[PDB]
């Protein structure tokens, strides 16, 4: 009986891919053949935020575009003032194995997680004046790979399970569970409206999720290996992923298909993190080779290189105002380029 | 050109800097050990001797270890193994009685860990649990069922030496890392003494490299 189930699964896949092929009337390389090349993008290290003594695995900007949180496996989660390179806070984590960090849009809370399976929430603004853990969200059976706040009360997280989860921070239970993946979920990008979020997994697929019904809207495939990073285009209707194969891919939700591949013969290593400029014309990507390549997102031409790092560029961040780009790497430095 | 509050903020940042420096100095005191191994209880006995990560801190002979167990992580190792690049050493627990086979999968795990790119120069502390149960099994049934190419007698010592050789020879890079081996059924302080000795040797090597003598 299972053979028949595999049979109509296969024919459904055939029909879906046939429709997707039908939709592929053109690609960006055709209609964007006429636009002006962005040209060389010379960026300088305007700041070099120092103080971490181990690998920096995640950083996240604040909505004010000045305060940024960075997490390192030295056991610390430092809240930095970007403009003056000052350390606003330094939260000591209970578990040093942290591979994600979030900064609440309101700026009241931060979150972190990793191999402990717990998404800790830290209350920055307290009457005592010290940052205190407010709620430890537990229930995942795998490492927390990514976590993004929706509100002060809700948070969406991706785990080393095949699942993501939406949690109510006030009560601590999993408001929703997202189950569809078949491999480790490594990254998670929240849409600008926060209604939907994408998640890239080690099954070489990126899945689109609807927050309020726990159901997968769409599945995107095409990567040759596990997807380490994912980020929405500022529209919220498209997103870019990077994988251990030396390519980034730009997927669009409405066309439900892969649009552009950002690859080069020289690059033979994985992409650790990905980000978009404010306008989306520049796609920033950090690499295992000790660099961050800036890609012309419309032409797929490499626009520039941020070469000032001594180890893997684990994390990237572009401010909401798009004034600067922060690159955090395993050399324990956190550079702000402009 | 700095306001009073800006100077105070800079002072706070310097205080955080010195606190971070002290925390880093204290962290360098620690010896990081990664615990790995097949079997649901083989590493449990070792943890007794001393979900997600469970850390078992312990100070032995003034040296403060920090052993992290990853047995509870049912996820792809290659995504998070690199978190332990700087781990001082890896304890690898294998039960000798698993030669019924589970021992071959333990060999595969050891091969994938020892030859991992991240663990290019992190010495492995190999433990061979259950030598008494291995004695029982080996006087019950032969080891040839596990290793058909085995060309030694049925005696316990020969089988143990053969298993040690099979596990050690998986190390393709003998010039950068070492495999310390121990039969760990003693159920006494000898296990902590052995891991302490291996860690002392690793620290001496790291100090020689840092001083430029190696």
């Amino acid at each position, epitope marked *: 009986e299972l053979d028949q189930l595999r049979q109509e699964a296969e024919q459904l896949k055939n029909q879906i891919r046939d429709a997707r092929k039908a939709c592929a009337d053109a690609t960006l390389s055709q209609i964007t053949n006429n636009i002006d090349p962005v040209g060389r993008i010379q960026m300088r290290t305007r700041r070099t935020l120092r103080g971490h003594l181990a690998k920096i695995y995640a950083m996240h900007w604040g909505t004010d575009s000045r305060l940024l949180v960075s997490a390192s496996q030295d056991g610390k989660l430092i809240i930095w003032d970007s403009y003056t390179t000052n350390k606003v806070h330094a939260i000591p984590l209970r578990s040093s194995w942290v591979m994600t960090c979030a900064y609440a849009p309101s700026g009241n809370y931060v979150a972190c997680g990793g191999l402990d399976n717990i998404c800790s929430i830290y209350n920055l603004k307290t009457r005592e004046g*010290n940052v205190r853990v407010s709620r430890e969200l537990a229930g995942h059976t795998g490492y927390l790979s990514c976590c993004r706040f929706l509100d002060d009360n809700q948070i969406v997280t991706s785990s080393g399970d095949t699942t993501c989860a939406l949690w109510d921070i006030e009560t601590g239970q999993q408001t929703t569970t997202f189950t569809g993946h078949t491999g480790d979920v490594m990254s998670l990008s929240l849409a600008p409206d926060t209604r939907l979020f994408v998640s890239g997994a080690c099954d070489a697929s990126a899945k689109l999720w609807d927050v309020r019904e726990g159901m997968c809207r769409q599945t995107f495939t095409g990567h040759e290996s596990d997807i380490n990073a994912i980020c929405f285009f500022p529209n919220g209707n498209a997103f870019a992923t990077g994988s251990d194969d030396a390519t980034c891919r730009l997927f669009d939700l409405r066309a439900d298909q892969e649009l552009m591949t950002y690859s080069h013969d020289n690059i033979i290593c994985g992409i650790t993190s990905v980000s978009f400029s404010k306008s989306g014309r520049l796609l920033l990507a950090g690499y295992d080779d000790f660099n961050c390549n800036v890609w012309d997102a419309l032409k797929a031409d490499r626009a520039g290189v941020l070469a000032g790092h001594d180890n893997r560029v684990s994390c990237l961040g572009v401010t909401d105002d798009g004034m600067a780009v922060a690159t955090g790497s395993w050399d324990s430095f956190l550079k702000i380029w402009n | 050109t700095l*306001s009073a509050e800006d100077k105070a903020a800079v002072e*706070r940042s310097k205080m955080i800097d010195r606190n971070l420096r002290e925390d880093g100095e204290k962290a360098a005191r620690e010896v990081k050990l990664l615990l790995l191994g097949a079997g649901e209880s083989g590493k449990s006995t070792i943890v007794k001797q001393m979900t997600g990560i469970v850390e078992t801190h312990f100070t032995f002979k003034d040296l403060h270890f920090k052993m992290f167990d990853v047995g509870g992580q049912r996820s792809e190792r290659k995504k998070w193994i690199h978190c332990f690049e700087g781990v001082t050493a890896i304890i690898f627990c294998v039960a000798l009685s698993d030669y019924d086979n589970r021992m071959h999968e333990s060999m595969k795990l050891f091969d994938s860990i020892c030859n991992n790119k991240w663990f290019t120069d992190t010495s492995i502390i190999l433990f061979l649990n259950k030598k008494d149960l291995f004695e029982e099994k080996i006087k019950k049934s032969p080891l040839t069922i596990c290793y058909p190419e085995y060309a030694g007698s049925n005696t316990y010592e020969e089988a143990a030496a053969y298993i040690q050789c099979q596990f050690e020879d998986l190390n393709k890079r003998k010039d950068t890392k070492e495999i310390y081996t121990h039969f760990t059924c003693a159920t006494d302080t000898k296990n902590v003494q052995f891991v302490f000795d291996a860690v002392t040797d690793v620290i001496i090597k790291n100090n020689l490299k840092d001083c430029g003598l190696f």
Partner: single-chain antibody
């Protein structure tokens, strides 16, 4: 809850010495810098001394330099003001004020109850109005002016508005002339141009009657204005 209690006040012969002690509880006392602020009888607040977190930087008023010494000790969560050669015009009720400095912080947020002491046998901040009568229900505006522009180059202005209800310690209403302090009702608001500043209350519930003070934090010595009184 956060609590600062002062002790060591009393009657002291002029020319004597006395140590004021501030016991702190309910917050990470070591993180906070601390201030001392006198209020002589029927007089406005007046800054005395400042001890930064970690006891790194010290500041004093020119009227207490040399004679007074501000100190702390974090392990017992206590602040001290040693006072020597007490002259007559040191008769005042001393406030122990808490203050944290980082981006987006709220300095002078909490004030202790204060201890009374009776000795017996620079940017100038101005407030024109006083003893302003107000029936409850409508809105009022109080004005404070500074001789030197309080807008710093970095772009944040440093006027602080405090409210002192009668028989109670002052509390922070506004910090940096725009930001409402935590727990303060939204009706209070601050505005102004870099040299002249105003605080407006939309609805004047009787609980908020009292004296409103303005303080500059651009540069030491910190200077309060003669507060404007609002009465029913």
């Amino acid at each position: 809850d956060v609590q600062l209690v002062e002790s060591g006040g009393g009657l002291v012969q002029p020319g004597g010495s006395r140590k004021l002690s501030c016991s702190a509880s309910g917050f990470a006392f070591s993180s906070f810098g601390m201030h001392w602020v006198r209020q002589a009888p029927e007089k406005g607040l007046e800054w005395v001394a400042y001890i930064s977190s970690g006891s790194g930087t010290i500041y004093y008023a020119d009227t207490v330099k040399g004679r007074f010494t501000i100190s702390r000790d974090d392990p017992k969560n206590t602040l001290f003001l040693q006072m020597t050669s007490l002259r007559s015009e040191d008769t005042a009720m001393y406030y122990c004020v808490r203050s944290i400095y980082y981006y987006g912080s709220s300095p002078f947020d909490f004030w202790g109850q204060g201890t009374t002491l009776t000795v017996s046998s620079d940017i100038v901040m101005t407030q024109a109005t006083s003893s302003v009568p107000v029936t409850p229900g409508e809105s009022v505006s109080i004005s404070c002016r500074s001789s030197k522009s309080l807008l710093h180059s970095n772009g944040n202005t440093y006027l602080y508005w405090f409210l002192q209800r009668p028989g109670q310690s002052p509390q922070l209403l506004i910090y940096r002339m725009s930001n409402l302090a935590s727990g303060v009702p939204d009706r209070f608001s601050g505005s102004g141009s870099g040299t002249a500043f105003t605080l407006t209350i939309s609805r004047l519930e009787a609980e908020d009657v009292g004296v409103y003070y303005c303080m500059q934090h651009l540069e030491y010595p910190l200077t309060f204005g003669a507060g404007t009184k609002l009465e029913l």
